[PDB]
Amino acid sequence: PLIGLLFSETGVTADIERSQRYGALLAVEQLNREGGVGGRPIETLSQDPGGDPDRYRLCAEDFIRNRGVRFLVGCYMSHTRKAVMPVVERADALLCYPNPYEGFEYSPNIVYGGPAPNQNSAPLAAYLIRHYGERVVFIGSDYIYPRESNHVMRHLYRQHGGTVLEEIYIPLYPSDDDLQRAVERIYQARADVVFSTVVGTGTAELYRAIARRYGDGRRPPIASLTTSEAEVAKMESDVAEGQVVVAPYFSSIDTPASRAFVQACHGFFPENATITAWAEAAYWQTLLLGRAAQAAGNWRVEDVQRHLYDIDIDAPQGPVRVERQNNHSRLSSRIAEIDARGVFQVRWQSPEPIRPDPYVVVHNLDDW
Amino acid sequence: PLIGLLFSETGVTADIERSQRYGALLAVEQLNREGGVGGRPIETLSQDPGGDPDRYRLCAEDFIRNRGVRFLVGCYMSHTRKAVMPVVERADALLCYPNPYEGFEYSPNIVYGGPAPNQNSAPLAAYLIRHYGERVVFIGSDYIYPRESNHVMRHLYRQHGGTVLEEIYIPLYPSDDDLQRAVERIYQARADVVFSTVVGTGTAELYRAIARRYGDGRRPPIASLTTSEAEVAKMESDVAEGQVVVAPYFSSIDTPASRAFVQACHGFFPENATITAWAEAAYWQTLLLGRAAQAAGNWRVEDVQRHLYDIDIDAPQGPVRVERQNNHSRLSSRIAEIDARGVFQVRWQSPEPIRPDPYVVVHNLDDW
Amino acid sequence: PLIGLLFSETGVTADIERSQRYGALLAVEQLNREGGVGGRPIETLSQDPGGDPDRYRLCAEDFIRNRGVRFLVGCYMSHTRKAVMPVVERADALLCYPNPYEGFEYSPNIVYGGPAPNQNSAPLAAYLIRHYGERVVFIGSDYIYPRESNHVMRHLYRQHGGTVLEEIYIPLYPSDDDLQRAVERIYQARADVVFSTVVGTGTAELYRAIARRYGDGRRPPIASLTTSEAEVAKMESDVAEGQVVVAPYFSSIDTPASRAFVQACHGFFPENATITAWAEAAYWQTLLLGRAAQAAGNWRVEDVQRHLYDIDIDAPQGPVRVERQNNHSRLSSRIAEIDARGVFQVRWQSPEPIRPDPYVVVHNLDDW
Amino acid sequence: PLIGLLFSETGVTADIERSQRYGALLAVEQLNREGGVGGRPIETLSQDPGGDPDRYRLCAEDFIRNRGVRFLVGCYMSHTRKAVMPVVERADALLCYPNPYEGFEYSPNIVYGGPAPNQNSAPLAAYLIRHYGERVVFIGSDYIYPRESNHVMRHLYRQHGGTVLEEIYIPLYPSDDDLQRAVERIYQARADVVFSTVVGTGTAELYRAIARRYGDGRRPPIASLTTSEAEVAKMESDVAEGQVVVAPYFSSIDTPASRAFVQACHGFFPENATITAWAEAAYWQTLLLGRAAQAAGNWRVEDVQRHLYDIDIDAPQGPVRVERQNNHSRLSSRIAEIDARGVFQVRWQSPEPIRPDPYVVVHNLDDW
């Protein structure tokens, strides 16, 4: 019962992936310190892909073709997930992708653990418009997630009569010049909201930059689908506060399962690992992978797969399940606001988990 | 009533796009020489993008932003369609894409006229396996269509217990060396079928090359989703014969609507324009665009859109319609075999048009 | 005596390459209608690469590997020249590159006919600084020529205590948005000169755009190393006038060889082919290729090569020669100013042809 | 007196760059434990770019724009050096590049410490031909160094009547499939020598792979310009032995300066840092940077630059100097053979350091 961890230690998204890695190691701990899985202990392998799509392929190639791994939890950025996809499909292995993403994808061998666009962007567009205004400017890192993410957010804004003013993209490893030239565009745009699809290290940099270009008084909020406790941990409180984010989970949610997860993360995560929605997603996904295997009583992927769609888990965010119709998960959807002291303060929460709909057709979407 | 034609005149796919352009010009002729559309004549614009995704953007930018065009029929290769997509969405225009493609896409402003993978690959995989063998090797041009096309064909082969031996990719503008090194791989692979996703000019080159590496006697057939009368028109009869292709239409199908279309193409297409399935698709799509506008009595896109999904057309391939749930079309699916004298000889035809399912999940697919 | 013409007919730089193609066809005419070359007539082949580096490779592959061509005149953009380079080197063929370019290259099989940076940028930097100011902003198409061109121009400006304010790059096939966002940067920069390395079709677009952002009164001149009668032919007189350009030749230079070339171009070039410095370069280079072959009395490349470096030609721009130490040419260097009626008005001309120095080390450069 | 170290800790070339980093830290130690530089201690900064050209830019951006660094030693792969180049030129800083590379480059702000092609490939081609045969096959990582490196090696082989059979390229992060498909080509090629321009981690993998495809008996040697004690440290003795490499230095050379450097490296380098030619180059370059600054008595780059070209250093490889005509160094050139027990056994050594000639014109090259 060997699992392969594909989470960067270094690179643009190293902070969030490290939270993710730990969320997964915690799950392993608990499944192990519960007599493991059929009296044998589950053992994990880790390599650092450094956020590079080719190193993810290589690492997933290595794990599968040389250490005989058939179960993987990892990948953050979508181009990184796609590079590993063919590899898992070729070797019949299973990968759990505990992250938010643009949609319009299906792999029989990939379990989608974070929200598809109808699960985060759909609710979020409505909140932003019906609470802050209809003018918005899009700023994203320059890769496939941001671009496809904005594609549907554009559709979403048009549905609700809002207006996309500008669509700005910056390198994943951006220069201050790049940052300064985009912030200026975002300033002069005069929108009511800033929809950020900037990931990793440029997140904090971008938010600070925006703050600073606006000085004293009213500046639009920065809404994002990725910004977590990971990236907020790198910003000044004034810079961070007031910022919006949708995700299935927040370290501060009221409830016994969250606190259970929280007080356990605190007793296991290294100081440079924060507690985020993505660490929550890698935790539940890892549990489920073990639970299914106990139920099958084997570490065969077919035997474990079978049981994957029959196990509902009482995850820190609420009850989750994995639809077999498209391999995505029914997830909670919370829209939290950041404190003047940098805690996520939930403002809205869907009345029940949202079923996944990866092929996003706005008009056939439920109107929040 | 101004329509923008986005079809290459030069470049890798110039032959097929030229057939497409003419299929569309013919439709215009007929809608015009039928009192036009509200007594004004429909007028078309053409520019040659040369198969380059950036020149397609530029051309669609030009047509929309300077000649006030809101209706377009064109694009062949998927990366070319995607480059134009944002442009049509930004300006609220409509583009008809009369071509086969990989799926997993949605735009409110794009009408998908050629088959999605459940419409051609699904039936085709079954035919190839249940008629030629289960061993197959994939050879494609190196861009997004071939790669995503093979992704689902891999799933398809695994469903039916077949085997993908090798996945080979060659540049869109390939050198003989490139061609020779891939053909060798395809030879040594010893498959029962060659699934080609090679497009434009390298098509004929590839097929000839394969033929020639096999000399006298048994060589697997070459099945493709794109090869049409366009590319077969460039190959020797022995090279062409025996080759498989799935598409909604073939210039040689028995029926009064085909012959009607055929004997009219013959009286309008220049000698360097052949009659293909893709010219059939650009013809029906153009008709429908006019018909809807007559019905709306206006060249507004909202007014024409409305009526788009209510007009079933009796296209040369049979009855077609455009589902409003995902903007794709219900299409016929024929699997023809090439003559020793190079005519497509239909061997199989779906009992009714296949409804489109762009989000391809093999297990939930109908088993042919 | 077969020569291969590699000049785009369509695409970003089609206008200039068409002038180039004709400059070369004229040379052929004259060498032919002079009893040819050893009583056999020289025959040319042309294909349209459309400005795409891969199609140039393919075309040069085709010409060499299938029509047995060993002599080529063509290529414009540097990435296009580099794609063909390996091909000519592999097959021992000779290519004449009649164009300006960034330097830092050597091929035994390539004859460099247009200026290296010490031949155009060096003189030009001095003129611009010692005549207009020391503040400059760089705007270029986004490919290897513009970027390497600015690299040395930066060195050059630092030598003479000038200042590079901004370095802006736009796609080869740019959107008005792209154009508008760069012009704005160039406006707000407040430089004394605009150094353009924008090529093909975006040239006119850029110059017009700049003009228009400045309206009435003082706007810095636009200096370029490529802008020719080709691209000026697409601009309004007010837009064109006052603009600077360095090149070895201008259709309007005083002299019997220029007029000879001019009055002959006029009697041979189609109306959509202008008379430029680059058509002058393809003409002299083609002559020399013939002359050497007469002298060798053969169309062998070794035999013709030998004589290449011994033939000084009295080209329309003055006496030229091809140094065997690095395959580049000693060329004239004129800095012309554009008329209010759009004629290039030479303002400066080097006292003798400048010997080529492709490995540009500013400090060891002659100070103009 | 602050110096910025730009050497990967993780990624494709992490092993060699780590040897390089240590070679530089050692130099600092010695200049410091020699009363430093003007009684203040020289202090270094390090960041891990992970072999990614964008992270090198970012890191060099960070070091310069935020920690006020004006002196840098680092970069390995040429695309990584080029990404940092504009940055150092823009901020007037100095970078020492202690590595072998393709040539055809000049920056006033870059000190070239490893050999240009006339310094390693030129001698080496002669040795290989006049000692092993004239048939050769080229295998390289797919980036600018390998490709430009082979460009000149092709010229070199043609000069000496040798033959380039095949030119094969593999990703920097290659799959076994990629490795297996290239080794096969290299096997079937039947050359006398394998010229490798494969760098980092795929080096060992490639050599092992080749060995293993050849089994028992005669297989051509593997000559390289980069393979060092770093990459040989990852291979079996039988795999490593017999292999050729040219570089200015080898940890095993007879001489008091080498042993001095060696016995000091041993007392400072961590166990995962080997002693290589590139660690020798970063050591001498760092010394020189200090020495010049002592001489100028200041850490100004102009003041230090002045003295850079006047200080000849008695480096472990012999006497070195930095030509001010092109910023490259006069270096020793040794061709060593690997032991059956994996020590580099020098077989040839140039009679004096070779002066650098970055603009490589084979015919004007000295014939070894």
Side-chain angles (χ1 to χ4, degrees), chain D residues 200-208 211 222 224 227-241 243 245 338 341-342 344:
Chain D
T201 315
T203 315
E205 284 160 2
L206 171 79
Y207 284 50
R208 160 159 34 274
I222 301 157
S224 156
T227 305
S228 79
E229 298 92 320
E231 302 74 32
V232 184
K234 296 300 136 127
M235 327 159 174
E236 49 207 75
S237 332
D238 41 294
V239 146
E241 84 161 82
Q243 265 33 273
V245 173
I338 317 188
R341 172 173 24 88
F344 287 83

Side-chain angles (χ1 to χ4, degrees), chain D residues 144-217:
Chain D
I144 193 163
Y145 158 81
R147 301 188 167 266
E148 298 290 346
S149 276
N150 288 330
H151 164 63
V152 166
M153 188 56 105
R154 180 175 286 289
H155 298 170
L156 228 14
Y157 260 73
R158 258 317 162 26
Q159 197 71 330
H160 305 144
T163 313
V164 188
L165 293 168
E166 260 262 25
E167 187 171 335
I168 306 149
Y169 289 105
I170 53 165
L172 274 162
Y173 292 100
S175 76
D176 303 327
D177 307 276
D178 284 320
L179 257 171
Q180 266 21 99
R181 289 190 196 92
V183 158
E184 200 47 47
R185 290 218 255 164
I186 300 164
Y187 198 63
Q188 320 266 69
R190 301 312 207 302
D192 302 307
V193 171
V194 162
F195 177 53
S196 181
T197 38
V198 167
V199 299
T201 315
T203 315
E205 284 160 2
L206 171 79
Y207 284 50
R208 160 159 34 274
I210 305 194
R212 293 231 249 276
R213 181 64 188 75
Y214 281 100
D216 311 272

Side-chain angles (χ1 to χ4, degrees), chain D residues 134-145:
Chain D
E134 62 167 74
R135 314 174 94 231
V136 66
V137 56
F138 300 153
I139 174 74
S141 291
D142 181 35
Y143 76 103
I144 193 163
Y145 158 81

Side-chain angles (χ1 to χ4, degrees), chain A residues 82 85-86 89-92 101 103-109 112 148 151 154-155 158 167 324-326 328 358-364, chain B residues 82 85-86 89-92 101 103-109 112 148 151 154-155 158 167 324-326 328 358-364:
Chain A
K82 282 183 184 294
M85 206 191 70
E89 302 197 338
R90 287 213 199 84
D92 304 306
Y101 90 118
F104 295 92
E105 192 179 281
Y106 182 82
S107 185
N109 307 72
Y112 298 86
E148 298 290 346
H151 164 63
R154 180 175 286 289
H155 298 170
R158 258 317 162 26
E167 187 171 335
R324 158 180 35 205
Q325 64 162 133
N326 49 22
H328 291 60
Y359 190 79
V360 193
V361 177
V362 138
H363 82 253
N364 312 107
Chain B
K82 282 183 184 294
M85 206 191 70
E89 302 197 338
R90 287 213 199 84
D92 304 306
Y101 90 118
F104 295 92
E105 192 179 281
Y106 182 82
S107 185
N109 307 72
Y112 298 86
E148 298 290 346
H151 164 63
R154 180 175 286 289
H155 298 170
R158 258 317 162 26
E167 187 171 335
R324 158 180 35 205
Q325 64 162 133
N326 49 22
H328 291 60
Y359 190 79
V360 193
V361 177
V362 138
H363 82 253
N364 312 107

Side-chain angles (χ1 to χ4, degrees), chain A residues 143-157:
Chain A
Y143 76 103
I144 193 163
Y145 158 81
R147 301 188 167 266
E148 298 290 346
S149 276
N150 288 330
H151 164 63
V152 166
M153 188 56 105
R154 180 175 286 289
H155 298 170
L156 228 14
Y157 260 73

